Write an enzyme that holds these catalytic residues in place. Structure first.
Site, mmCIF file in Angstrom:
data_model
loop_
_atom_site.group_PDB
_atom_site.id
_atom_site.type_symbol
_atom_site.label_atom_id
_atom_site.label_comp_id
_atom_site.label_asym_id
_atom_site.label_seq_id
_atom_site.Cartn_x
_atom_site.Cartn_y
_atom_site.Cartn_z
ATOM 1 N N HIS A 216 5.063 -0.344 -20.963
ATOM 2 C CA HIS A 216 6.410 -0.304 -21.521
ATOM 3 C C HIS A 216 6.934 1.108 -21.638
ATOM 4 O O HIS A 216 6.177 2.068 -21.807
ATOM 5 C CB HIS A 216 6.526 -1.037 -22.882
ATOM 6 N N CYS A 217 8.251 1.203 -21.567
ATOM 7 C CA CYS A 217 9.006 2.388 -21.940
ATOM 8 C C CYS A 217 9.775 1.999 -23.212
ATOM 9 O O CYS A 217 9.140 1.543 -24.155
ATOM 10 C CB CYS A 217 9.863 2.905 -20.764
ATOM 11 N N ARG A 218 11.087 2.196 -23.287
ATOM 12 C CA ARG A 218 11.860 1.697 -24.432
ATOM 13 C C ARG A 218 12.280 0.248 -24.185
ATOM 14 O O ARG A 218 11.999 -0.622 -24.997
ATOM 15 C CB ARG A 218 13.098 2.562 -24.747
ATOM 16 N N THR A 224 9.175 1.584 -16.511
ATOM 17 C CA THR A 224 8.166 0.533 -16.431
ATOM 18 C C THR A 224 8.131 -0.110 -15.046
ATOM 19 O O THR A 224 7.047 -0.317 -14.487
ATOM 20 C CB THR A 224 8.465 -0.521 -17.518
#
Ligand code: VO4
Length: 282
Positions: A216-218, A224
């Site tokens: 994950h990223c944000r 991602t």
């Protein structure tokens, strides 16, 4: 020709159509809906495909790109941390790759809890974080590694390797070279941990839903998706899988925003070109 402007424009055309088709409707049967008034989606228009959802109260999806199996999710909301940790533990997660930077995590307005660099208790789950290695990825970009130990009465204790790109840039993409290095580190970390489970005779090794890298990223659709695409190109089982295939697969299995930005698609195209991998399906 195969990597020229015309081919690239056709690829973008196909993908744009798919994004539009997959856009969520109100109460869309294809997408996971919140239970009651608690927020499920960190971003209102970045939703979680229902059929491939990992847990009913997370924005997180099983994704298989060719032969490559992963989980892509949003950065968990504070209210989701206990469920997120339970997901990580039940999956026997062989690597957690976090592509949100330290600066982003520190930005309180973004509501991204520092859940893997600190220890804490979340409902019934207690978590301990320990720092391990640091691996340079190129261009001064550094992967900081941790082990996250997840403890809960009634559950087996699980330790999860973490790869955190702490100085991931905030308004641009990392290069294909950095992406390749990151995919190799994430895959290698996962292989070592998976092997430990296999050596112990874990039943998770036989379960298609378990032992998946979690990325994950944000929002779990940009950085991602760039990483997941690079991981699938790093898997020698995926000969002849096209860029069209991989991005279509990510989109149908999570949402239409996977590979959110043209800048990210550019990296995937460059990686494919380096391998002589097709952009389009014939
Ligand atoms: O509960 V296990 O994934 O060690 O069989």
């Amino acid at each position: 020709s195969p990597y020229g402007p015309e081919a690239r424009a056709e690829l973008s055309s196909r993908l744009t159509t798919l994004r539009n088709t997959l856009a969520p409707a109100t109460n869309d049967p294809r997408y996971l809906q919140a239970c009651g008034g608690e927020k499920l989606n960190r971003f209102r228009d970045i939703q979680c495909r229902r059929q491939t959802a990992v847990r009913a109260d997370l924005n997180a999806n099983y994704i298989q790109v060719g032969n490559t199996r992963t989980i892509a999710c949003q950065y968990p909301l504070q209210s989701q941390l206990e469920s997120h940790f339970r997901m990580l533990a039940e999956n026997r997660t062989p690597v957690l790759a976090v592509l949100a930077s330290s600066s982003e995590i520190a930005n309180q307005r973004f509501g991204m809890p520092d859940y893997f660099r600190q220890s804490g208790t979340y409902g019934s789950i207690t978590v301990e974080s320990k720092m391990t290695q640091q691996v340079g990825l190129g261009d001064g970009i550094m992967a900081d590694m941790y082990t996250l130990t997840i403890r809960e009465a009634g559950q087996k204790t699980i330790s999860v390797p973490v790869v955190h790109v702490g100085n991931h840039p905030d308004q641009t993409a990392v290069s294909s070279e950095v992406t390749k290095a990151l995919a190799s580190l994430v895959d290698q970390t996962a292989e070592t941990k998976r092997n430990m489970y296999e050596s112990k005779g874990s039943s998770a090794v036989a379960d298609d839903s378990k032992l998946r890298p979690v990325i994950h990223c944000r929002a779990g659709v940009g950085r991602t998706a760039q990483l997941i695409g690079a991981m699938c190109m790093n898997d020698s089982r995926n000969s002849q899988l096209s860029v069209e295939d991989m991005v279509s697969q990510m989109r149908v299995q999570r949402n239409g925003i996977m590979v959110q930005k043209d800048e990210q698609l550019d990296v995937l195209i460059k990686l494919a070109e380096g391998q002589g991998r097709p952009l389009l399906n014939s």
